[PDB]
Amino acid sequence: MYTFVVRDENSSVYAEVSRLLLATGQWKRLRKDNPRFNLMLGERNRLPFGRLGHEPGLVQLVNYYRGADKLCRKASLVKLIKTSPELSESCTWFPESYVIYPTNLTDEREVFLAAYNRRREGREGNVWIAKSSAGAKGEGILISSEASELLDFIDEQGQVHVIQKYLEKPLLLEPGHRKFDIRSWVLVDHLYNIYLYREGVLRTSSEPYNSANFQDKTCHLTNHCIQKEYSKNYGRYEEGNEMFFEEFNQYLMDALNTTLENSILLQIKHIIRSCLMCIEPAISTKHLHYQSFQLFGFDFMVDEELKVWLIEVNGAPACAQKLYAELCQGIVDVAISSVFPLAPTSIFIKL
Amino acid sequence: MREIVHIQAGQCGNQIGAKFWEVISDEHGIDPTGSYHGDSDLQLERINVYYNEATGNKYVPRAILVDLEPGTMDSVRSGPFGQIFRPDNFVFGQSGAGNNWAKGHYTEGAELVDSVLDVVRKESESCDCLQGFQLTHSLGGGTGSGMGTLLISKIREEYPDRIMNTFSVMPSPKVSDTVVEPYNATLSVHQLVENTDETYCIDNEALYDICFRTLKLTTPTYGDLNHLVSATMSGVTTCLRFPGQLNADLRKLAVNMVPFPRLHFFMPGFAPLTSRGSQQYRALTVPELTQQMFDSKNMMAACDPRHGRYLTVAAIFRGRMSMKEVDEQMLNVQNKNSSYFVEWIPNNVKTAVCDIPPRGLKMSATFIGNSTAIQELFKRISEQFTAMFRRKAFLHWYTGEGMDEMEFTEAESNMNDLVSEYQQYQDA
Amino acid sequence: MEVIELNKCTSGQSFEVILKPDPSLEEIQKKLEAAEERRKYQEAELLKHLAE
Amino acid sequence: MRECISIHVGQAGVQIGNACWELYCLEHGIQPDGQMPSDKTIGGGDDSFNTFFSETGAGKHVPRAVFVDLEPTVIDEVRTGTYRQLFHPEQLITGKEDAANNYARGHYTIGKEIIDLVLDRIRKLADQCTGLQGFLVFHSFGGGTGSGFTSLLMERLSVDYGKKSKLEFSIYPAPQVSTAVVEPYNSILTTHTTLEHSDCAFMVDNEAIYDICRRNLDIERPTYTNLNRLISQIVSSITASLRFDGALNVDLTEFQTNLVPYPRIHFPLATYAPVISAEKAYHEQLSVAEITNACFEPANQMVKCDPRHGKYMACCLLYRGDVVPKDVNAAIATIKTKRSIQFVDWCPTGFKVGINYQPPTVVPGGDLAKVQRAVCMLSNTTAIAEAWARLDHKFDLMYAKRAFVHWYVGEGMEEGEFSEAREDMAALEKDYEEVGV
Ligand SMILES: C=C1C[C@H](C)C[C@@H]2CC=C[C@@H](C/C=C\C(=O)O[C@H]([C@@H](O)/C=C/[C@@H]3CC(C)=CCO3)C[C@@H]3O[C@H]3[C@@H](O)C1)O2
Ligand SMILES: C/C(=C\c1csc(C)n1)[C@@H]1C[C@@H]2O[C@@H]2CCC[C@H](C)[C@H](O)[C@@H](C)C(=O)C(C)(C)[C@@H](O)CC(=O)O1
Ligand SMILES: Nc1nc2c(ncn2[C@@H]2O[C@H](COP(=O)(O)OP(=O)(O)OP(=O)(O)O)[C@@H](O)[C@H]2O)c(=O)[nH]1
Ligand SMILES: Nc1ncnc2c1ncn2[C@@H]1O[C@H](COP(=O)(O)OP(=O)(O)CP(=O)(O)O)[C@@H](O)[C@H]1O
Ligand SMILES: Nc1nc2c(ncn2[C@@H]2O[C@H](COP(=O)(O)OP(=O)(O)O)[C@@H](O)[C@H]2O)c(=O)[nH]1
């Protein structure tokens, strides 16, 4: 009888995982501060990794990778891409980004201005977007074509921000003339196998894309939280502004004569592999006294030439309501039971 | 050589004490003559903990025998090992104590107590470095109960910095001599709470049930009950008697076992216990020792451990087996039932292994637990106490020796306070 | 990478490689004595209580 | 030549001390009677080995060592052991009754009675020294003598010998081999009281040594004897620079200079390779690159932690056997591309390297196979704070209910010392964090 504890009550995914583990009739939940556990579904912040792997007679497993935050925080991700030889400044799937510390606090202000001026003089599209990790849902974002308003927005705040070239020519779903972003769920187990969940979700805008107004952030921001509030067309084309893969694929076939696998997924798999392989030496628990796994949420943008772009990586992602059952069961099957066995058509794609 | 001085008092104390010396003498290769005959040097390494070497070349138990009448002790002298004890260490009166705590504590006992202390002092002076004392007695009668606690009080005054340890037999109506046993036990428990470091609670109720249920003995005797006690006593004192890393002396055991000074009342357990007769020939697997040892059925305090939580546990395994297997099984028990071990005392279960097994067995396990479920014992006794005390029944036996009602009221308050203290830490 | 301060002898070699750039006696005595006094006082209380 | 005096306190300290001196004798060709044939300067010398052994006109080579324990059974083993002739009675100090796993008993109650005698015996050895360098103190964290008496000794050594350096080898508490529930109390009490007085301390977690013994020596359930022979190798590789001709870590002051910029953060992490079972029929012989790489595998560390998630303040490589600098430099470059190694901004990314040509000596009939080359890495990394965090947390659980506290107060310690000591550790945990960021 395997034991486990729960230290994140606000986790949508793992509560389902918890419920599932009990139903096995071979997993027993313990009080959250009891250290004789096989499995830890730990807290998001300041998880005591240092206290794992020192309980004799217990193989211990946690649901986070110590170090994975380098990929999952905005500033760190940019830094990681610029300074890693295998990703490099010349990386073709990540938007030109710059790290900007507010003046009331190294920094890349003058490097950003240097490229911004090159674009202005060269008649090239010069819209940028500012954001950070402190962006509580829909707020903390400014889209502009003027560097003055961008840098001034960042100074008014107190935390580190990033400036990222805003892709001005997204792929637009018809009917609607509307923006979208793709969410992929990736599970990395204790052996560092990288499993991509079969199902993704397109989180779509319900308002036609309008390049003449970067002020009204409803047709520009795909965040579900924003759509369910400020958009008056929320749910017109698809339920909850969520298009799944069967439909999106059918659409690409009908409208563009291409498949989801060929035009987009290949690039997604390539990016997921590149990111995770890069930090593998930093975070692998292959010879550690405890073992990690983690579920990530990769966010992608597609442009009008069918090129995929990495937006951000999430370390504690939720699922889409209709997909919770399947994915959570998968986490159990491949992440947990692999280490702790209970007594064909995988839902994952092994990258 | 860290010496322990042994005292047995009253009928129950002397009978159980005599059996203990029989069992451990055999284990150490000492015959009724006091002359050694053993194959292994391990036997003689820490013999001086319990035995004196008075002359070439016999070993004499550092044991003092105490009673207010001569019968049981006379019988001890007749017994197989009677000649082994030092004749001067027999200290007896003639009156008896009439199953009366007050007679043992205040009247008859007071007359004889200095005589006992003279012998105790005589033994103690001859100690290169004295650890402390262990007392065997019941709480149900008068001599072991009333005079026993009196001795402990006097001993503490004379040696305030030694460890005081006792094996105390609690009464139960299932094995009962008289109705005043709850009065005597309640008065005694209060003395123990104040003045002992370690008390092993041997419940006659548990001993009986283990005989009735597990051993399939329809009519158990005191002899059957005492065989359980001598087996357990041999097991709990293994660490003191043989070379070892853990709980190797009284103070170290107390430091590991006792997180709060008043809560020092332990439930012992033994394994294996097997009904005759077919099954006895097969040796037991290490997993089997472990599982029986933590079994409530194997507990000798008649409390259900599942009703409370363990503060501390000490286990002992003898003899020839795998430490690797011993560690694995021990870790299994805690890992599978971790709710039953307080989380605020990390790693509260310590395990020892000794090579030499008990006589008649290939291997065995002794359990000593500081559980909060021990409160069930004191509760049971508190109930029986107040049932009579409400109506002041049988009190005249006590008031007649000079005690008054207040002392009874105080004793009952203190034991109810003791029960409350246990409840506190079961909830924490 | 740079090597420096190389020192050789019959027994062996050593070098550097750079990749990039109180209580007084009286106080102690006082503390030990203070602990001893506290021990004495607890025992006196014990014997006092025992005398009762 | 400057002398070093070794002091071994408590069971762990004395038993480990015994293992090291056995090894020191094998390494230097000193016989159990203490005669060293190869030493042509009879009756005296100022060779490098003399820093650890003095000499008698009779030709005997005598460890500059003091063994202290509150109970006499462990030191009696020394007195009566294979190497009994080496030591003399004034070197060995025992008591009648021990500290009972109680820091306060070892520090206050029993320590007060025996401290003056210990200093006197140490003084006798120091009087024998032309240029005393300082002390190496071997002890456990968890025992009452090891924690309590050692802390008192350290305070008084700072007083009688203010200029001198003091190094520590401390056994960190581990339940697989642990003898007491209150070791966390004792560890924190001793760490608080000893922080000011120690210049450099090498922690060895019994958990790590235990697992290495199980994993690489294939011992089902290791004893203290298995544990100590492994520990003594690490100690020997650390002290080899003091006992042999060389230019690195030649004196005790060099340890602090090379491994401890920040005085409070004076606990370097030790990693050792390779550990190979003698019972193994044949083993391939690891290269310089392989053993050096193994220095960055957590499984080879004396304390389990993840240096990938901390920062280095200093790194030091001590090789023994067939090693040349070019192989070392090559290996470091390869490791540097693969492994993750971050230094603090205020320190250079670099390694100080020491090489001794004599391969590691092994005890005959031990569990350790002879190998042609080996390395011990000393690195001052913030990751070792993980060990403090574990200790402090266990301390916190028990202390919140005040479990076991009365045993300490009963010896004369005040409750305030507990919180005072825990506060110090909280500060120490912060110091590592600030440096570690
Ligand atoms: C075999 C088991 C259950 C599992 C398989 C054994 C598991 C592994 C090792 C030891 C046992 C615990 C030991 C004895 C035991 O459980 O006995 C029970 C009964 O006495 C209740 C004991 C509990 C156990 C513990 C650990 C704390 C509280 O008391 C009595 C149990 O019916 C006996 C038997 O079924 C026990 O737990
Ligand atoms: C021999 C025993 C167990 C055993 C040995 S091998 C096996 C599979 N079980 C234990 C011995 C333990 O020391 C305790 C002895 C208790 C004696 C009994 C109370 C009683 O006196 C005795 C006559 C018996 O009841 C049995 C003979 C059945 C006794 O062997 C039961 C028992 O488990 O003793
Ligand atoms: N590695 C190793 N650890 C030991 C050894 N002996 C004891 N220990 C560890 O040290 C701690 C026990 O402290 P000891 O050194 O035995 O106790 P002490 O210092 O003699 O103190 P007292 O017994 O209280 O007088 C436990 O954590 C043991 O695991 C040993 O020989 N080798
Ligand atoms: N460079 C860019 N070009 C075009 N659109 C962009 C963009 N960067 C962000 N966006 C849009 O803005 C939205 C903001 O999402 P972003 O990844 O910036 O923050 P976030 O809400 O996803 C934080 P987290 O995923 O950690 O919870 C995205 O959904 C995307 O549609
Ligand atoms: N287990 C056990 N209990 C006993 C024995 N003799 C008496 N008792 C119990 O001890 C209590 C009687 O006290 P006892 O010791 O005989 O009286 P004392 O001589 O005045 O101390 C009752 O609870 C009896 O059940 C014995 O040999 N074994």
Ligand SMILES: [Ca+2]
């Ligand atoms: Ca009379």
Ligand SMILES: [Ca+2]
């Ligand atoms: Ca010489």
Ligand SMILES: [Mg+2]
């Ligand atoms: Mg998002």
Ligand SMILES: [Mg+2]
């Ligand atoms: Mg009687």
Ligand SMILES: [Mg+2]
């Ligand atoms: Mg009777």
Ligand SMILES: [Mg+2]
């Ligand atoms: Mg000791």
